[PDB]
Amino acid sequence: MFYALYFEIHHLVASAALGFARVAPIFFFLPFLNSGVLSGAPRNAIIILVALGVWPHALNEAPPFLSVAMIPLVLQEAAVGVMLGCLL
Amino acid sequence: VIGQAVNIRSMETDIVSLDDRLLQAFSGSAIATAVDKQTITNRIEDPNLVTDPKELAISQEMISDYNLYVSMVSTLTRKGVGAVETLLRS
Amino acid sequence: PENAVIGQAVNIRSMETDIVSLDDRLLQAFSGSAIATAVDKQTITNRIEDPNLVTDPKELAISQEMISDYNLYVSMVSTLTRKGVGAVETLLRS
Amino acid sequence: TNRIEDPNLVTDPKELAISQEMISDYNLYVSMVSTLTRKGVGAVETLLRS
Amino acid sequence: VIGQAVNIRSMETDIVSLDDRLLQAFSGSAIATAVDKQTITNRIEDPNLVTDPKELAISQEMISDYNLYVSMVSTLTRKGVGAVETLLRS
Amino acid sequence: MGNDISLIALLAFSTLLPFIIASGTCFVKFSIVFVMVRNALGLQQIPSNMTLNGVALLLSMFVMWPIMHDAYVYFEDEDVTFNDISSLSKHVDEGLDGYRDYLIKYSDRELVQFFENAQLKRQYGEETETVKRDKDEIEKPSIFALLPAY
Amino acid sequence: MGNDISLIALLAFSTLLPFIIASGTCFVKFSIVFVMVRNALGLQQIPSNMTLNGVALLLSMFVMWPIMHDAYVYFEDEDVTFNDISSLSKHVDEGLDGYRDYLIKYSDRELVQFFENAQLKRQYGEETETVKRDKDEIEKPSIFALLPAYALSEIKSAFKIGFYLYLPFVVVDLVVSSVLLALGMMMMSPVTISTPIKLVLFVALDGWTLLSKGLILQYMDIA
Amino acid sequence: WSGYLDDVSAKFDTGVDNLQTQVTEALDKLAAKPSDPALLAAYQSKLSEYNLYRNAQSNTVKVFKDIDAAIIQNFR
Amino acid sequence: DNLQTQVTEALDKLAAKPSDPALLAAYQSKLSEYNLYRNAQSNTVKVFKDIDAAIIQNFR
Amino acid sequence: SGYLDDVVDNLQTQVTEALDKLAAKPSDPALLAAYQSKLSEYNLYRNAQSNTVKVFKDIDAAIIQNFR
Amino acid sequence: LKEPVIVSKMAARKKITGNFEFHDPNALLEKLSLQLGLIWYFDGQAIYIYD
Amino acid sequence: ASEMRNAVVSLRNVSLNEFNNFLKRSGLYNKNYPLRGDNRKGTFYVSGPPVYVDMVVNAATMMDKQNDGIELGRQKIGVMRLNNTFVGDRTYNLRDQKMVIP
Amino acid sequence: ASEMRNAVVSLRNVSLNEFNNFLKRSGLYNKNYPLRGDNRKGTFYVSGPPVYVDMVVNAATMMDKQN
Amino acid sequence: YVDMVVNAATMMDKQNDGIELGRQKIGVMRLNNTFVGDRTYNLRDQKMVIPGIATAIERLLQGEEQPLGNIVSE
Amino acid sequence: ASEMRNAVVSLRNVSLNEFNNFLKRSGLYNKNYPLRGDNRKGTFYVSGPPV
Ligand SMILES: CCCCCCCCCCCC[N+](C)(C)[O-]
């Protein structure tokens, strides 16, 4: 099926985008990751790579959240990330 | 001449039925159904329909809309994180 | 119609009165713009699906205008909205 | 340029079929180099300006 | 030739402040623009002018000059506003 | 696809979000009380402003997140129909009452009424205020009137 | 839509909007007053500037709205189309009178007139003298003169208010020290006791309600 | 159910009322007696008239397609 | 809509007798003029609205 | 299609049918002249549709970029 | 007057005071038109008044 | 009450009296909101509740295009005998020559 | 009162006297807001409440095409 | 119910468009009083041709678009 | 139960009586969810579980 690789790349970037919401706050709190040290073009490139390194589901199948209101979800994930940043 | 009609008193909207489709940015279920169909297909029917002008005009809608949806989510997450950082510094 | 001209005796305007709230003045704008755009998009689509419209120069010349006017309208609403929120942001971060 | 002026070369069907290939290759070569150099400097801009 | 008239004397005004110099430059440009656009529109619909090579050769220039002039005024206005914004942000 | 104006409204809202939170939410109270207590104990920078703001933010979400989620659940509702700009305005306004009620609960009636007058009365040739019986206006103070009073 | 140049003008205006609000509007006064109150109470971080400026912006919106609405309705009117530069320019000018007349109540006459004198074309001898009648001079000085005079007079009037706000707390701060000396506890820092007194006094006085009301009353008229 | 280039073809097909059948008839008669000069003289006229009918029809539909395609190209 | 009406009249007269050279000669002219008119109108409409879009893009 | 799922004829059909009829006798002038105008109207329809879909997507892309 | 009356917005700004007798309206109307600076018309269905 | 709707309708093939009968046979007629117009002509005005108005306008406009295939123009043959002259083109023979008159 | 409307209409096939009669049979005719013009010609002026003006302008202009 | 009714009605309608209902019939009519064919007379110095009924009627109706009616002396 | 589904189907060559027999020999037929229509004609309604 011809378009399947194209869709499979878009599923990847949608998963990475929703992972950034939960990984970036940690990079805000820790003293060796905050923007007093790591800044400019490296910063996003590294955060995204980590988020893809830890996402739990196979990257090549459609993301399950397409049916849901995006804002309540993004705020939920950011709150979780803030809690983890405190505990670490 | 034939079959002519006009509504005189009030601007009751009739070209469309006014509906909750006004109140959403993306018909995410219609995306999730189309993305299903173009991905469950693995060795059934046939590949390579680069060439028929009727199906090739249906692919144009999906290929565009999924690119827009993915582009939007990228901005919303940055905004959210930026709002949290803004409050925590201030 | 073409064989008729229809005026208004004198254009008094009750909606020139400011009396509603700063937020009712917002809801009116939002609701009216959303309806206007949905109607325009539908009309443009019909003018293309229907075979006698999409193949007569007289009708095509009109559809070209409809499309351009739609484009300009939406682009300007977007621009002014951005400028507006950007002012708030500029002041409150100062 | 010199092929386009020798009257023997400019009027023989055999030779024209060669000139057409030569000019198509020159065009593709220069478009390639001019694109990759622009990408190359664009990387430096991205890293330093950012 | 036939039924033709020209205004000999322009009305006049004092110019005493940067405010009036600005309103005057604005009003001077607005009218010239409206006049040009109308003129072109008419030249496109008088059938003696749409179909004659000598008249088409003129309409081409009028359209070009209009495009260039409005693009200049747009650019220089945006440059001025950007210089103010830059200094106050700094 | 969707509707191009509801898209603008979504993106705009998400830029204003932190100022709304900072000015019309219990975050206002929580972030103040902690810093005051910290000064009273007489040893600044223990706990950090990072700790305090972080906790205050988290607690504010328990109060406010259900109200936003309820509003989106109100709008994602496939059974409605409309006929006119008025009928749509009413339904959109009705969607915000969940938030309006919270602001009404925690704010002063008379300061709210004062701003409700001040939006208009520069227009007015008259002194009488009874001219609308309260039952509508008492329910429907505008949100811009409620915010600073809260 | 419309005249292409009118469109450019609208977009330029909307681009400069925040600097106008920041330099020719009551927002200037409210912003200062709230911060001075925080300093008088002696708080370094409470409330946030992001809260104070939000309140100040909302309060300013009420005062400024009616002028923006009136000017909008004045221009969204199909009444006329214009023959000439002088007719168009005087039609434009007559639309700003509502704002011009707002600025005139609060800027100061002598400073305004000095700035108008400043704009005139230079002369080699000192400029030829004039006196002008009220319909220009009282009614219609130019806006490029009014605007800075307004900004300066507003700042001044703001400092004045802050002065009065400080006085009662100064009284408190002195009294409390004198009583501690009367009790002999000479070494204790009085800040530890004066600060809560100040807070008590401000809440019992309900200073926020009074300030927010009276500031609006200076511009609105409410009955 | 049809467009406007069919309205333009049909203006010819209803314009020349009957020619489309008259040709076939003339051929049916001539085929029976090719050596008849009155039949030959009639057929020459009908066949020429039909040839022009078809050419004018096709060139007109070509021109209207060239106008439409150029307007549509500007929708960009 | 005068030049739109003239061409539809000419077409009816021609369709009535496709072989009359006087009618053919008239129709050739009418159709050619209409053909130039449409193109000129469409092109100028385009130019006028590309200028507006470029203005908005300048401040956007 | 023979199918509806509960919850006239278009140029796409008419072209396929006129091509199908023509291909049986490629040398008949009535059929040729009937096919020229259907293939032309189908070409115009199928261009105009795609060009306007493209315009609506570029509008939405510009909005998202403007709020970036 | 036995007709509905329409007053232009610009005319509605003017003010009047005193004790008046509507004994012959057409004669009163024209006189006040001249004193106040108004212009008026009558189509047969309604009276229109402008500045 | 404020929701009343109003419309004007102008048929081509179906007289008003033709449509009234359809409403009656259908059992859809309502004497509180009757159609107002000329039973002879085909133009009328209707006002009332939304559902009623919409049904009326739709049904009328469909009836109109359905009856449009009715063909009403017809040709006739008249036979006429001449009493005083020969019908056909008339030949005389002169001494050596035929000559002919229309 | 401030909502009165009016229009001017020209009929290419139906005389004013032809139309008044239709209004009478319809029972739409209203002597407080009669049409004003020349019974012989086909041009007239009308004014009245907005639903009346709109009804008149539409009925007359459609029937002008029917005949 | 409404959706089932609507779709069933529309598809039953479309399944009949190909059906043709018109028909042609043949009438045989003997002439009681005259010869059917075209008559021709050969004379010492003349030839004369007279068209028959079929010839005259065909020559009259040829090319007619409208239906006939009222001959007079779904 | 709320996953039940409905359709209307219109055949052009075959007919309902032809198709029932097929289901029968297949052993697919289900008297709980029979096809509803005119056996002589070629249009019918069907409702049932998705598969
Ligand atoms: C922490 C913010 C992000 C997650 C949203 C939490 C919403 C509030 C849920 C509170 C439930 C409390 N409970 C179980 C007593 O109802």
PDB file of N, CA and C in Angstrom, chain L residues 21-47:
ATOM      1  N   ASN L  21     -55.621  21.263  -4.681  1.00  0.00           N
ATOM      2  CA  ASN L  21     -56.202  19.928  -4.711  1.00  0.00           C
ATOM      3  C   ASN L  21     -55.221  18.886  -4.200  1.00  0.00           C
ATOM      4  N   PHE L  22     -53.938  19.043  -4.511  1.00  0.00           N
ATOM      5  CA  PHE L  22     -52.961  18.097  -3.997  1.00  0.00           C
ATOM      6  C   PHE L  22     -52.899  18.159  -2.482  1.00  0.00           C
ATOM      7  N   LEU L  23     -52.815  19.367  -1.931  1.00  0.00           N
ATOM      8  CA  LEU L  23     -52.834  19.510  -0.476  1.00  0.00           C
ATOM      9  C   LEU L  23     -54.057  18.863   0.153  1.00  0.00           C
ATOM     10  N   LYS L  24     -55.228  19.076  -0.435  1.00  0.00           N
ATOM     11  CA  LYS L  24     -56.440  18.492   0.131  1.00  0.00           C
ATOM     12  C   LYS L  24     -56.414  16.972   0.073  1.00  0.00           C
ATOM     13  N   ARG L  25     -56.099  16.397  -1.083  1.00  0.00           N
ATOM     14  CA  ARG L  25     -56.056  14.942  -1.162  1.00  0.00           C
ATOM     15  C   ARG L  25     -55.019  14.380  -0.203  1.00  0.00           C
ATOM     16  N   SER L  26     -53.896  15.078  -0.044  1.00  0.00           N
ATOM     17  CA  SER L  26     -52.870  14.680   0.906  1.00  0.00           C
ATOM     18  C   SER L  26     -53.290  14.822   2.357  1.00  0.00           C
ATOM     19  N   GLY L  27     -54.294  15.632   2.662  1.00  0.00           N
ATOM     20  CA  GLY L  27     -54.630  15.803   4.060  1.00  0.00           C
ATOM     21  C   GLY L  27     -53.680  16.717   4.792  1.00  0.00           C
ATOM     22  N   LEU L  28     -53.032  17.622   4.066  1.00  0.00           N
ATOM     23  CA  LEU L  28     -52.039  18.555   4.572  1.00  0.00           C
ATOM     24  C   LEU L  28     -52.555  19.975   4.635  1.00  0.00           C
ATOM     25  N   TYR L  29     -53.676  20.252   3.986  1.00  0.00           N
ATOM     26  CA  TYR L  29     -54.272  21.575   4.010  1.00  0.00           C
ATOM     27  C   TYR L  29     -54.592  22.017   5.429  1.00  0.00           C
ATOM     28  N   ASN L  30     -54.518  23.331   5.634  1.00  0.00           N
ATOM     29  CA  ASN L  30     -54.782  23.979   6.917  1.00  0.00           C
ATOM     30  C   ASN L  30     -55.482  25.295   6.636  1.00  0.00           C
ATOM     31  N   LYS L  31     -56.751  25.383   7.018  1.00  0.00           N
ATOM     32  CA  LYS L  31     -57.546  26.580   6.791  1.00  0.00           C
ATOM     33  C   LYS L  31     -57.128  27.803   7.595  1.00  0.00           C
ATOM     34  N   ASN L  32     -56.202  27.701   8.540  1.00  0.00           N
ATOM     35  CA  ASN L  32     -55.738  28.913   9.203  1.00  0.00           C
ATOM     36  C   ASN L  32     -54.651  29.647   8.441  1.00  0.00           C
ATOM     37  N   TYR L  33     -53.965  28.975   7.523  1.00  0.00           N
ATOM     38  CA  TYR L  33     -52.864  29.575   6.768  1.00  0.00           C
ATOM     39  C   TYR L  33     -53.000  29.292   5.276  1.00  0.00           C
ATOM     40  N   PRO L  34     -54.162  29.545   4.694  1.00  0.00           N
ATOM     41  CA  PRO L  34     -54.357  29.195   3.290  1.00  0.00           C
ATOM     42  C   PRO L  34     -53.444  29.978   2.365  1.00  0.00           C
ATOM     43  N   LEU L  35     -53.203  29.396   1.193  1.00  0.00           N
ATOM     44  CA  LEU L  35     -52.487  30.086   0.130  1.00  0.00           C
ATOM     45  C   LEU L  35     -53.309  31.254  -0.385  1.00  0.00           C
ATOM     46  N   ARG L  36     -52.645  32.378  -0.594  1.00  0.00           N
ATOM     47  CA  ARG L  36     -53.266  33.603  -1.079  1.00  0.00           C
ATOM     48  C   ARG L  36     -52.783  33.986  -2.469  1.00  0.00           C
ATOM     49  N   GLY L  37     -53.699  33.989  -3.431  1.00  0.00           N
ATOM     50  CA  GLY L  37     -53.342  34.328  -4.795  1.00  0.00           C
ATOM     51  C   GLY L  37     -54.500  34.083  -5.739  1.00  0.00           C
ATOM     52  N   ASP L  38     -54.185  34.048  -7.028  1.00  0.00           N
ATOM     53  CA  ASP L  38     -55.165  33.837  -8.090  1.00  0.00           C
ATOM     54  C   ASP L  38     -55.212  32.387  -8.550  1.00  0.00           C
ATOM     55  N   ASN L  39     -56.340  31.720  -8.294  1.00  0.00           N
ATOM     56  CA  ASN L  39     -56.501  30.330  -8.703  1.00  0.00           C
ATOM     57  C   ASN L  39     -56.171  30.113 -10.172  1.00  0.00           C
ATOM     58  N   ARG L  40     -56.358  31.132 -10.996  1.00  0.00           N
ATOM     59  CA  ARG L  40     -56.071  31.040 -12.424  1.00  0.00           C
ATOM     60  C   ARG L  40     -54.582  31.139 -12.735  1.00  0.00           C
ATOM     61  N   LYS L  41     -53.862  32.038 -12.077  1.00  0.00           N
ATOM     62  CA  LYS L  41     -52.442  32.221 -12.340  1.00  0.00           C
ATOM     63  C   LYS L  41     -51.629  31.180 -11.582  1.00  0.00           C
ATOM     64  N   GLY L  42     -50.315  31.347 -11.596  1.00  0.00           N
ATOM     65  CA  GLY L  42     -49.416  30.469 -10.886  1.00  0.00           C
ATOM     66  C   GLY L  42     -48.483  31.112  -9.887  1.00  0.00           C
ATOM     67  N   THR L  43     -48.842  32.263  -9.335  1.00  0.00           N
ATOM     68  CA  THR L  43     -47.986  32.944  -8.377  1.00  0.00           C
ATOM     69  C   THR L  43     -48.781  33.164  -7.107  1.00  0.00           C
ATOM     70  N   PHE L  44     -48.166  32.855  -5.970  1.00  0.00           N
ATOM     71  CA  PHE L  44     -48.858  32.918  -4.695  1.00  0.00           C
ATOM     72  C   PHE L  44     -47.883  33.259  -3.579  1.00  0.00           C
ATOM     73  N   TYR L  45     -48.451  33.619  -2.434  1.00  0.00           N
ATOM     74  CA  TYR L  45     -47.719  33.946  -1.221  1.00  0.00           C
ATOM     75  C   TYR L  45     -48.197  33.082  -0.066  1.00  0.00           C
ATOM     76  N   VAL L  46     -47.272  32.689   0.811  1.00  0.00           N
ATOM     77  CA  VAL L  46     -47.575  31.768   1.904  1.00  0.00           C
ATOM     78  C   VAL L  46     -46.846  32.220   3.156  1.00  0.00           C
ATOM     79  N   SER L  47     -47.530  32.157   4.289  1.00  0.00           N
ATOM     80  CA  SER L  47     -46.940  32.512   5.568  1.00  0.00           C
ATOM     81  C   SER L  47     -47.444  31.615   6.683  1.00  0.00           C
TER      82      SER L  47
END
